Structures are given as C-alpha cells and as structure tokens.
Amino acid sequence: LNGGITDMLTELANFEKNVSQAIHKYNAYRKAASVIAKYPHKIKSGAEAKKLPGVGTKIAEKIDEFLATGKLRKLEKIRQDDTSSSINFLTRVSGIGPSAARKFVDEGIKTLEDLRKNEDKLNHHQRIGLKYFGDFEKRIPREEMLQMQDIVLNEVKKVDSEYIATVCGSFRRGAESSGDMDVLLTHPSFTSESQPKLLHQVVEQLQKVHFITDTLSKGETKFMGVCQLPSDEKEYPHRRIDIRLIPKDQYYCGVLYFTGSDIFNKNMRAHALEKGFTINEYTIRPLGVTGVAGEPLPVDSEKDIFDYIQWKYREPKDRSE
DNA sequence: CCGACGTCGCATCAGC
DNA sequence: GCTGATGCGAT
DNA sequence: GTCGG
Ligand SMILES: [Mg+2]
Ligand SMILES: [Mg+2]
Ligand code: NA
Ligand code: NA
Known about the structure:
The protein is of the alpha+beta class. The protein has 4 domains: 2-81, DNA polymerase beta, N-terminal domain-like (DNA polymerase, domain 1, Orthogonal Bundle); 82-138, 5' to 3' exonuclease, C-terminal subdomain (DNA polymerase, domain 1, Orthogonal Bundle), CATH 1.10.150; 139-257, Beta Polymerase, domain 2; 258-320, DNA polymerase, thumb domain (Beta Polymerase, domain 3), CATH 3.30.210. The protein has 16 helices and 9 strands. The protein has a 5-stranded mixed β-sheet, with helices on both faces. Strands 1-3 form a two-stranded antiparallel ribbon. The two termini are 22 Å apart. The relative contact order is 0.07. The structure holds 3 DNA strands. It is classed as transferase/dna. The entry lists the keywords dna polymerase x family, dna synthesis, TRANSFERASE-DNA complex. It forms a tetrameric assembly.
C-alpha cells in the first residue's frame, strides 16, 4: 500500500536521531510512519496523508515529492554522504548511540572492521554489541523462546522455590517470534523499602549452567545481558535477555507494562486517565479532586488493575492495542 | 508564537 | 575519592 | 516535525 512512504519516513527518522541528534524529530517521523502503516488505502497525495494525526505540512510535501519522482532529493543526498551514513550505520551496534557513533566517525572509525581494529577505544557494552552484531539483529522464533523459558523457570525455582518469574514482552502475547527475552522476578521477601543478592543469585545460577554468556549491565534490580541455548548440530544465535527484580506490591504493574504492546499500554493508560486513574510501570494511583495523584492502590494480579479502571480483563494475546 | 515531545537503571565521564 | 551529569537502551 | 495551549 504505502511501504515506500513508511520506509522513507523511517529512514528519515534514523538520521534525525542518529545524525542530527534531534530525538523529537525522530519520534515525529516514526509517529507518521505508524499512522500511515495502519492506513488501509494506497495514498495518492500528501494532502490525503495530511489528514492523519502526526502528518503535517513538511511530511505532506515529502509524500508529494516521493509520489512524483519515486525518491526524495534530501534522502538520496544524505544516503550518499560518507560521514552521515557511517554515523547512522555504526549506531546499529548496541551500546553505540549517536554520540559515540559521531566520535568514532570523526576519527576515521567508520565500519565494523574499523571497530574490530580498535577494541581499546570501546567500552564493555560496545565490544559485546560488536561481538554479536549479527546475532542481535536476528529474531527469536517462539519455539526457541519456549526452550529459553524452560531453562529460566527451572533455574530460578531451583535457586529458591519461592521466586515468582514471568517472561513478558511479545512472547507473553503469544507472538510467533521475539526480539529479546524480558524476565520479571519477584520474591515474598522483597517489597518497597525492604536482599541485594536476590537478583545476583539468579544471574549466577544461569551463568553456572552456561545459559547466560555475557553481561552488559547488572545492579540490584536490573540485569541486561546475553544468553544462548545449548547446542553435533548448528549452534543457536546469542540472544538479548533482561532480568528485572521488582518488589512484590509493584510486580503486577510491572508485568502488565512489560507485556505491552507499546500501543496497548498507550490506549490502556489513556482510557485509565479518563476514569480518573494514572498507571505507570510501578503503581496505579487515583487522581484527586484537582489532579493530585494519591496513594498507590493495592494490586495482587493483573486483573486488579483492569478492575479499578472498569475495563474488561484482556488476555495477553489480545493486547496489540 | 513557542514549549512539550517518557522516564529511569546502570556505566562511565567531568568536575571538584 | 565523591557527586552529579551524560549516554545508552528501552513497554 | 507536529500538535496545541
Ligand atoms: Mg524452598
Ligand atoms: Mg527488552
Ligand atoms: Na495531520
Ligand atoms: Na546502538
């Protein structure tokens, strides 16, 4: 329908974020690319697009140009630019954002090769991003995700049978593949102000059984790293895994948010707002007579939240929006 | 015309 | 050495 | 870049 338009907008989005360092323009282009991707008609003019929320004058004009010529002069130019295309490209390495990408490129470090020759200039996260550059862009079929979940539940329950662990993200919604694995962890000993080894013990056991292979970051509540399923057949790609330790009374807010989708949480938070409730990742709080958030409300399941805002409990599988 | 546009854990930097 | 700022990746 | 107070 409109793939050349949404690809153009997304390509424009990356340059804003990665090259121009204009995060708000990057979000503007993505919002336009979104509303256009969900629009069930081949767009015939910019004015037609201008009607969607998030498509403004400049994007209307760009669609017009793309439609008359099949390209954008500005995009063609930026694509052929050595500095800018390299800056944009290097940011595909996890841990290299717009600012590290610019410094590298300033000093002639432009490709994954140049990064290979220059490990001493790279921090821990950046080497791991480089090391698994290829793997980190592969998707994870559900079947692998299920084997990954097997290992995670087994090993956590093994460390202490009173842990509760839930694998969230698109996997929880029954998606056919996933980009990474997001595990939320709680324990009856952990509430609000309340060991700082409850997370460490889990990471430890999963390294012990060679499931977790590398660490990007780890503190007392959040872990970010890499894992790989065990292999005379072909080895599995290395995967991103995050592990979060959330207090008991915030756990179900956490589970809901990190189940997504993006848009579902958008809509739900919005519907929530009009019923005079505000839901963040931690709490659901009732907005008082003048806009004052009061106390976090007691929550013991996902359903509890869904009740408060008089919404119908939704299965994770119907949470695209 | 002009400000908002998400918010925060962790790693690491800049400054004292 | 410590403190607060900044960069990054993110439902 | 778009929106909206
Ligand atoms: Mg026990
Ligand atoms: Mg994730
Ligand atoms: Na519009
Ligand atoms: Na990156």
